[PDB]
Amino acid sequence: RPNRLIVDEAINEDNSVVSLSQPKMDELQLFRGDTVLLKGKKRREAVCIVLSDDTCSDEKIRMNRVVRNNLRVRLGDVISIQPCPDVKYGKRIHVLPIDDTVEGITGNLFEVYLKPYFLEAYRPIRKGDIFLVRGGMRAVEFKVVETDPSPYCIVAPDTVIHCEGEPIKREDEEESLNEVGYDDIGGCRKQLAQIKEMVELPLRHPALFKAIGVKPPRGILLYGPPGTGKTLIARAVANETGAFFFLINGPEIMSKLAGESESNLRKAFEEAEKNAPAIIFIDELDAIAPKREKTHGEVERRIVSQLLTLMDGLKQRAHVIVMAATNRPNSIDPALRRFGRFDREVDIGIPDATGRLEILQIHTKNMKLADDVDLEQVANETHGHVGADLAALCSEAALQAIRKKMDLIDLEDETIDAEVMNSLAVTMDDFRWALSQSNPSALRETVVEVPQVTWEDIGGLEDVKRELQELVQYPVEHPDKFLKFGMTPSKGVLFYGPPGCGKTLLAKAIANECQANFISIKGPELLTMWFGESEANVREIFDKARQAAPCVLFFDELDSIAKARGGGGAADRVINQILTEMDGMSTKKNVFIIGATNRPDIIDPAILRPGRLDQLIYIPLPDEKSRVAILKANLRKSPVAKDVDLEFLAKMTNGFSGADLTEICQRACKLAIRESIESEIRRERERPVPEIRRDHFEEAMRFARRSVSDNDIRKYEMFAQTLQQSRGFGSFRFPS
Amino acid sequence: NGPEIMSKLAGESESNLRKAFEEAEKNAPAIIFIDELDAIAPKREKTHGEVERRIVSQLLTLMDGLKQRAHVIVMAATNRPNSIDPALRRFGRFDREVDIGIPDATGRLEILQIHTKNMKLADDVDLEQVANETHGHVGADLAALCSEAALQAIRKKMDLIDLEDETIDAEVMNSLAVTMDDFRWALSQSNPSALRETVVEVPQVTWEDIGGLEDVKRELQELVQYPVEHPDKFLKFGMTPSKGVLFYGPPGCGKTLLAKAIANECQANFISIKGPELLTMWFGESEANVREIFDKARQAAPCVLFFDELDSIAKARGGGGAADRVINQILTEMDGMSTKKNVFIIGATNRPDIIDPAILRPGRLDQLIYIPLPDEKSRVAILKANLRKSPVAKDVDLEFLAKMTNGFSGADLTEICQRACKLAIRESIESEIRRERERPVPEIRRDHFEEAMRFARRSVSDNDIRKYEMFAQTLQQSRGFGSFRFPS
Ligand SMILES: CN1CCC(NC(=O)OCC#Cc2c(F)cc(OCc3nnc(S[C@H]4C=CCCC4)n3-c3cccnc3)cc2F)CC1
Ligand SMILES: CN1CCC(NC(=O)OCC#Cc2c(F)cc(OCc3nnc(S[C@H]4C=CCCC4)n3-c3cccnc3)cc2F)CC1
Ligand SMILES: Nc1ncnc2c1ncn2[C@@H]1O[C@H](COP(=O)(O)OP(=O)(O)O)[C@@H](O)[C@H]1O
Ligand SMILES: Nc1ncnc2c1ncn2[C@@H]1O[C@H](COP(=O)(O)OP(=O)(O)O)[C@@H](O)[C@H]1O
Ligand SMILES: Nc1ncnc2c1ncn2[C@@H]1O[C@H](COP(=O)(O)OP(=O)(O)O)[C@@H](O)[C@H]1O
């Protein structure tokens, strides 16, 4: 029947809920909240609530792991759908905790966290399948045995959910939801989808590779700082996609008595190729196979060469993927990067911004979060933390809450039931204490981010916004028209203008609008690389942009090296290496190399050349209309009272940049907070204000900073004229 | 394998090394391939263990004793020749270096068709464009690029043909048509493996791509093409042909273009050493790398070596006495390569006044060719060559645009035509998105050039053009000897 689709990872967290596209929903005869019934590859069915999501196509039907392990359907398989609506309100259903997840958890766990979830929202029920409930810091898999003599059941107040719990073991057909999967990684979206596309076809359908002459991907080089989830990602898309996952430690093979270690290395590969299409994971390929040139012993050279020969001979069987984990690609010997041996690098990188947020919800869903936690704030607070730190941060705050409840509940030495854990509510105190205690593991590594700065956060510069969106967004969506006229699109823009005017903000907005990774190389980094004669690190930065494509590379303070030299002939070491890497990356056509200069007059003229930063966009001081938008964008988060006059503050400030207005609004916020704190402490010492009042802005404007004024604004205009190059050719007309 | 012999238990590894040579000399005239001679025989001086020294010495003795049988070739693979111990380069032991180098330009194209002939390519793929797109990729990357695009097409067809777990026949594969989407996605996903290595290329720039400079073209074709095809007449008169030309003139006027055209006309390899490379070697005190560059030109002969921005090192010092580190090593290597007579050492200076006078000497860059700003006639050819690929409407007046622009270099006219193309593409995209939001232009119209000429750049003008002319006079050295006649 045409009512059969392909499964996709669900963007929601609700269990027994199917998210489908609206045209497919009406083609499938589905209403807004109609129950949709599914038939899997094996003898099991599960009725689910339909959901209208616009992020998926008709064929892509979103499903959780909950409605995937019971349906015996892996990610990227065919699901059969047929509706069958009957009332059938459940009469004394037989949901049971029968599994291996109920260990050391006793008490009223049968109903404490089932009433808020399993007895709410009229969710559909089925027998023979297993759903999941996350409560009391516990993710419990509950199976249901009887749901009335019908394959379609809906929960009801008379379902009773009577208690018949047993330690009955699970069957091998069902997959453990406690085991990792696609939903257990949140900090990586593009990098996880890369591995998905890489290894879904070779693993799910090895017969196609055996049939069609292709070179299957046999070798992965997942690299990144330790604790970023490379092992987690390997286990996730090796058990959810594949069926066997080997986890040789790395130090285990470097530790054993030479011959036995190599025997284990051979035997792991053999068992991978003997059992089924599997994934071999080398967690410490940097340790097993370091740079052979710098090695001293020869038995380690024998280990490296034996690994090389095993990988070269692993071209057979057409179905075995070999994932390898390391901290950086320039530390492995330059022989594990050859064709057929870890030729694909899928660099993970530090989790960035909302990605860290997307990690926290994975380690908090089983836990509780009360109602006062600012997960976005703690996500912006945890800068420089790999996913392991966020797992520890979510575990240290939970342990802080538990240890604060230990004094409340004294003498407790039992299973501690599951009701007090349900009553546990981790607040901002525990998370703040854990964040203060937690230490970043990967902070000095350059962060590859997708910025949260949008066009709404950019005040004014409408002409600059139009030029940017017609210069970088145009080629990425209309390549045919660019190819027809025979012109390589301009890559690289040098934003010149007054400092603190919105160049980094504009670059971040460009990165966010195109949903591309953003690498900001600030002036401190360039000056550090210049002073220590570390220009060879510049290459690494570009290599990072090559491994995080598409990138919106931003060289903030491109004149910082020129400023540090006095402000002869320019052409410094780091700037020259930047020029060389720009010439190298001009053929990438996937990374943008945006620059920035707060003093464009003292700059290397080589930076202004085709292939390099040819297009020049001037970021002028905001005018009367632009300052209103700048102040509104800098005060959207702040609770500003309506009685203030921002469009008059725009009129009064004439030569104020975006940074100056941001300082003005931040000082107004500071005075508002100071007055609120003074009032609160005075009331506490005796026994307030809900918004930034007018007087706060009145007092803040007394320290109104104008960083750039008069001749400085002239200089850019001078550099404008010298770079506008009208040269008297304006208003030039051809003859008829 | 190489690592196979470095991996086994010493004695068994050497037994396999002996037995491979024996079976090669026992069966028939064969070829022994050492895929990792760099791994089997690294620099013996820097090695720590002695059993690896035993391996290196045993390989050396086997190769020395391989002078027999008169029919066994022994190929060896490595990443660079300066990493092997300086004993596997002796006579009779890998004495011939046949350096492969990164595939260059159309060569990468010539690789793609090898990995695409068995595959399909639909009808919209621009193989030349993706060949120009895959800069810095070895043939393995192109094999993976042709395999990742094919796999992208297959995986996009997996959703169309559901439930397929069979041999998948051969008819749907015939119906498979890899388009530009798959190749673009694979190129974005693919990572270059050899990008930092210097590229040895045969340029696609021909004399047709060079606008104007007919006298310079004639001088070049009579100065470098003449000796390579008439050596007997050069030998008869007793004169070593001039090797090395210093192109001086305004920047962005066609010096690199002329060098590439010279390389393409003679079908010789082209090595471009730009100003960034020289400045990097000067700043890091890496002048020893200059040798390597010349060594590359020695292993890619014939070469048309081009030192773009030969005054870049002098510019970075202020613009005393010149004679910088990298320029001095370049002088030494020029003196070394003056006896090659197979590589040309063309230079380029956008500011020839501040240059090392040692660079102007016999054996070194003696001949000097001035690349002047294009005149009224040359600008027509420059604009036509820069607009051959672009679909320019016939109603435009390029020979009038040549008249209007006076001090415009080739780079300035190229920027003008590129900006006209940019405005044409912008108008086309605006019209298309407006039609899509409501429901165009087929060529670069007149108004596009009209708007582009409003930002007409003149990079070099007035006294700058004087300076080269000054350097012309100081180097023309008429000295009053013009119109000098012998007595009868
Ligand atoms: C006159 N002579 C004749 C022969 C030859 N001319 C020819 O025949 O070919 C012309 C072409 C082209 C082209 C391309 F080379 C890359 C493209 O893809 C866009 C894209 N994808 N990602 C990016 S980065 C972006 C991702 C968004 C966030 C930021 C970074 N860009 C892109 C965007 C802007 C600039 N540059 C590349 C499309 C093309 F049409 C040379 C000249
Ligand atoms: C007065 N004292 C008396 C005794 C002695 N004089 C004498 O008796 O001998 C004179 C001679 C000679 C000669 C030669 F030494 C090399 C030749 O071959 C040409 C060639 N082949 N490839 C190249 S490079 C080219 C390949 C094309 C693309 C670019 C690079 N060139 C070549 C071309 C231009 C300049 N130089 C070499 C021919 C000769 F006739 C010394 C002076
Ligand atoms: N992107 C992520 N999302 C969720 N959890 C993560 C992420 N990255 C790391 N973690 C957590 O950090 C831990 C890292 O463990 P592991 O993957 O074995 O080591 P490594 O990350 O060094 O390979 C995992 O237990 C995982 O729960
Ligand atoms: N056009 C603008 N709209 C909104 N905020 C701006 C604008 N320009 C600057 N800002 C504010 O200035 C602050 C710093 O700006 P910055 O990016 O450092 O300027 P520049 O790029 O000139 O150095 C940011 O917090 C931002 O909120
Ligand atoms: N004589 C010419 N004919 C055609 N195009 C030219 C000419 N001179 C320069 N150009 C154009 O200028 C651009 C860059 O020139 P370039 O080789 O950098 O000049 P220079 O060698 O003086 O630095 C090239 O894309 C080329 O198309």
Side-chain angles (χ1 to χ4, degrees), chain A residues 455-461 495 497-506 508 554 556-557 596 598 619-620 622 626 629-634 657-663:
Chain A
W455 291 130
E456 316 163 10
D457 291 357
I458 313 302
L461 315 168
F495 286 138
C501 214
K503 296 170 248 97
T504 87
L505 267 281
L506 267 166
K508 282 189 280 181
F554 184 70
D556 197 26
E557 305 158 87
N598 44 88
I619 315 301
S626 320
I630 283 187
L631 279 165
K632 217 70 63 57
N634 293 327
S657 41
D660 302 342
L661 291 158
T662 309
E663 293 275 6

Side-chain angles (χ1 to χ4, degrees), chain A residues 598-673:
Chain A
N598 44 88
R599 278 170 46 77
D601 50 347
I602 310 297
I603 207 48
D604 197 3
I607 216 71
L608 315 167
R609 203 163 297 190
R612 298 151 190 175
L613 319 183
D614 40 19
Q615 188 78 25
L616 254 60
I617 304 186
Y618 175 54
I619 315 301
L621 279 186
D623 61 83
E624 180 168 299
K625 198 66 62 179
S626 320
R627 287 187 284 273
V628 196
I630 283 187
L631 279 165
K632 217 70 63 57
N634 293 327
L635 286 168
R636 268 158 42 246
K637 295 284 291 185
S638 303
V640 201
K642 51 189 67 174
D643 47 24
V644 316
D645 206 353
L646 296 186
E647 56 267 1
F648 175 64
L649 215 53
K651 298 184 195 325
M652 292 296 291
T653 66
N654 44 347
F656 276 38
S657 41
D660 302 342
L661 291 158
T662 309
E663 293 275 6
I664 287 321
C665 72
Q666 283 313 118
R667 196 171 322 276
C669 280
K670 178 196 190 307
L671 299 159
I673 300 167

Side-chain angles (χ1 to χ4, degrees), chain B residues 103-364:
Chain B
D104 43 328
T106 172
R108 286 162 326 201
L109 181 41
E110 297 156 57
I111 291 185
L112 295 151
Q113 311 152 222
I114 312 299
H115 304 308
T116 301
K117 44 174 193 57
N118 54 343
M119 213 212 313
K120 227 71 196 66
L121 77 167
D123 52 351
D124 79 315
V125 294
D126 209 8
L127 271 195
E128 59 94 12
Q129 180 57 267
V130 309
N132 303 349
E133 214 72 30
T134 181
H135 160 64
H137 291 214
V138 281
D141 306 15
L142 296 163
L145 160 70
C146 287
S147 186
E148 283 276 8
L151 280 187
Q152 172 89 338
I154 291 174
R155 98 173 76 262
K156 291 187 323 189
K157 206 70 48 182
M158 290 300 295
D159 311 339
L160 296 203
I161 323 179
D162 318 55
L163 184 75
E164 48 167 298
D165 175 38
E166 306 86 27
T167 56
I168 323 296
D169 199 324
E171 324 176 20
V172 280
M173 302 298 113
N174 177 31
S175 85
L176 282 197
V178 180
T179 181
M180 191 42 45
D181 309 43
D182 314 280
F183 271 108
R184 196 63 44 187
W185 174 88
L187 252 174
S188 75
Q189 148 152 346
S190 178
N191 44 349
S193 316
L195 181 54
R196 301 315 181 287
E197 287 84 356
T198 80
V199 52
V200 168
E201 59 199 296
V202 193
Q204 323 289 149
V205 168
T206 180
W207 291 130
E208 316 163 10
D209 291 357
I210 313 302
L213 315 168
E214 191 197 320
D215 54 341
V216 173
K217 281 190 285 205
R218 165 161 55 251
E219 292 160 18
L220 269 172
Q221 225 170 20
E222 86 182 8
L223 192 128
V224 67
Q225 192 225 342
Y226 274 12
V228 308
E229 66 194 359
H230 310 123
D232 44 351
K233 312 303 291 175
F234 262 87
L235 280 152
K236 162 172 183 284
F237 286 81
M239 156 170 205
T240 53
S242 45
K243 163 193 301 311
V245 164
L246 181 100
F247 286 138
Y248 66 105
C253 214
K255 296 170 248 97
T256 87
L257 267 281
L258 267 166
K260 282 189 280 181
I262 275 295
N264 180 273
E265 181 77 8
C266 304
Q267 287 302 135
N269 307 64
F270 184 75
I271 305 193
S272 178
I273 303 103
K274 293 169 270 282
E277 263 94 337
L278 300 170
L279 227 41
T280 304
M281 292 187 291
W282 172 60
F283 270 126
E285 307 214 6
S286 319
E287 61 261 348
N289 292 80
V290 178
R291 283 203 50 253
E292 296 187 347
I293 280 163
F294 279 79
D295 284 359
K296 177 64 68 173
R298 201 169 317 266
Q299 296 270 12
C303 266
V304 201
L305 284 150
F306 184 70
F307 291 99
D308 197 26
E309 305 158 87
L310 207 41
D311 67 299
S312 193
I313 313 115
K315 278 189 297 187
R317 282 181 51 244
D324 321 303
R325 326 168 46 103
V326 48
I327 277 161
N328 182 79
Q329 284 262 13
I330 282 171
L331 290 158
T332 315
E333 289 295 327
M334 279 166 173
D335 294 9
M337 288 261 251
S338 66
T339 79
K340 232 296 190 172
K341 292 300 165 206
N342 205 9
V343 292
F344 222 78
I345 284 145
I346 302 182
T349 37
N350 44 88
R351 278 170 46 77
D353 50 347
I354 310 297
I355 207 48
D356 197 3
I359 216 71
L360 315 167
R361 203 163 297 190
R364 298 151 190 175

